[PDB]
Structure formats: C-alpha cells, structure tokens
C-alpha cells in the first residue's frame, strides 16, 4: 500500500495533531534537535515518487500527518523547479516558496482540515506556523539537490514528470 513514517516514538511531541519531529536544518524553527541521521523530511523525499500516485492514505500516527504534509509540499516545489534553469536559481526560488504563507490546519485553503487538528490557541498557532515554514524551507533545499543534475539548467525530467500528479488528489494550492 502507501508508505508510512517510522519516526513515531512514544516520547514524540505533538504540535496540533501533527508530529513535532527533528530535522537536520540550518533554518530556524521549533524543530527539536536531530536524534538519528534520517529525519521526517528524508522519508518524504524518499517515499515521494511511490506515494504521490496513491489516492487513499490510512493515517496511523501523527507522524503520518507530518509526512503527508511534506509530501504535498514537494509537489509545490516541483511546480517551481520545473520552470527554473539552474540549481542556484532553484535554491533561491525555493526559499521564496518556503517563506510563502500557505494555509494551515483549520484555514480555508488547507486541504484535509477534516484530518488535521487546528491549533487550539494563539501559542500552538505560532509554533505550528513556524514549524511548517521550517519544514518547507529544509524540504525545498534538499529536494533541490535532487531535481538538478550535475549538469545545471537541467531540472531532471525524472522529477519534473510528477508536476501534474497530486498526492491524494489534494493540493496546498488547491
């Protein structure tokens, strides 16, 4: 079936009903310190090509919600990297997209509100916002090393080809 996250510890913290997982990142955010060598962002970029094709996804733990969120974000990144003409350009174009304020759980525009709990108060609200942007930035960075082939100006068609495919038929821009 679809691929689930395996980074859900009994002592894992919850931001809303998503999982507040670690992330190797030079970007600011409420993300805990990296425990091992593979963070949630690694699982998303990894399982992506096989997950994006699915329409249904059985949510098991809050780690799945973080996974699903990043997955959907990769789709956003590719729709940008697609029109790029250099890794540098992409690196820059991603920062801007990560800084963009996409809708979050509870907001009209955020698909899947019936699955993602809404922040219960202004504090959890600011944390969640920060986290999501943090993930967006890190993900958009790594994904950039991938999409671009050692021969710059070449956004690999092996990533660009998925631009029109939406995980669970859902979208952060739709």
Partner 1 sequence: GRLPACVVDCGTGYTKLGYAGNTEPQFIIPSCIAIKEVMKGVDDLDFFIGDEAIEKPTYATKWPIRHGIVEDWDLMERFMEQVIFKYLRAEPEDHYFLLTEPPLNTPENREYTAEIMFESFNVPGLYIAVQAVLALAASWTSQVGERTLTGTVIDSGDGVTHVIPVAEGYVIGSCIKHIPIAGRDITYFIQQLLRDREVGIPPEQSLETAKAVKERYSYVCPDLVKEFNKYDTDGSKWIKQYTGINAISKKEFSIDVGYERFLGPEIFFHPEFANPDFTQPISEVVDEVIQNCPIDVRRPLYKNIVLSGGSTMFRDFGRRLQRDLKRTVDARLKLSEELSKPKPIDVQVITHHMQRYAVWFGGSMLASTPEFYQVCHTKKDYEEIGPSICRHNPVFGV
Binding site for partner 1 (CB under 8 A): 1, 3, 46-47, 49-50, 53-56, 157-158, 160-164
Nearest CA to 21 out of 12, 117, 29 is that of: 12
Q: 148 — phi, psi (to 5°)?
A: -90, 125
Minimum CB distance to partner 1 smaller for 118 or for 146: 146
Shortest Å distance, C-beta 1 to partner 1: 8
Q: How far apart are CA 154 and CA 157, in angstroms?
A: 8
Minimum CB distance to partner 1 smaller for 92 or for 164: 164
Shortest Å distance, C-beta 12 to partner 1: 23
Shortest Å distance, C-beta 38 to partner 1: 14
| Local structure of 162: helix, strand or coil | coil
Shortest Å distance, C-beta 50 to partner 1: 4
Minimum CB distance to partner 1 smaller for 27 or for 54: 54
Please classify residue 42 by burial: count the beta carbons closer than 10 Å to its beta carbon, then call 0-12 exposed, 13-18 middle and 19+ buried.
middle
Whether the Cβ atoms of residue 124 and residue 15 lie closer than 8 Å to each other: yes
Residues making up the chain, counted from first to last: 174
Minimum CB distance to partner 1 smaller for 71 or for 133: 71
Shortest Å distance, C-beta 76 to partner 1: 18
Distances (CA, A) of 154 to 12, 118, 160: 39, 40, 10
Minimum CB distance to partner 1 smaller for 57 or for 102: 57
Residue 44: strand pairing partners: none
């Amino acid at each position: 079936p679809a691929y689930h996250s395996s980074l859900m510890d009994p002592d894992t913290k919850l931001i809303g009903n998503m999982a507040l997982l670690p992330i190797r990142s030079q970007f600011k955010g409420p993300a805990p310190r990296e425990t091992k060598d593979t963070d949630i962002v690694d699982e998303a970029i990894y399982y992506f090509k096989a997950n994006v094709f699915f329409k249904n996804y059985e949510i098991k733990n809050e780690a799945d919600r973080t996974l699903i969120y990043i997955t959907l974000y990769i789709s956003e990144c590719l729709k940008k990297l697609q029109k790029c003409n250099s890794k540098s350009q992409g690196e820059k174009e991603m920062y801007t997209l990560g800084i963009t304020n996409f809708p979050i759980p509870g907001e009209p525009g955020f698909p899947l509100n019936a699955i993602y709990a809404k922040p219960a108060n202004k504090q959890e609200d600011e944390v969640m916002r920060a986290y999501l942007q943090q993930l967006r930035q890190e993900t958009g960075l790594r994904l950039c090393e991938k999409v671009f082939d050692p021969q710059n100006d070449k956004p690999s068609k092996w990533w660009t080809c998925f631009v029109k495919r939406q995980f669970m038929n859902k979208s952060l821009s739709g």
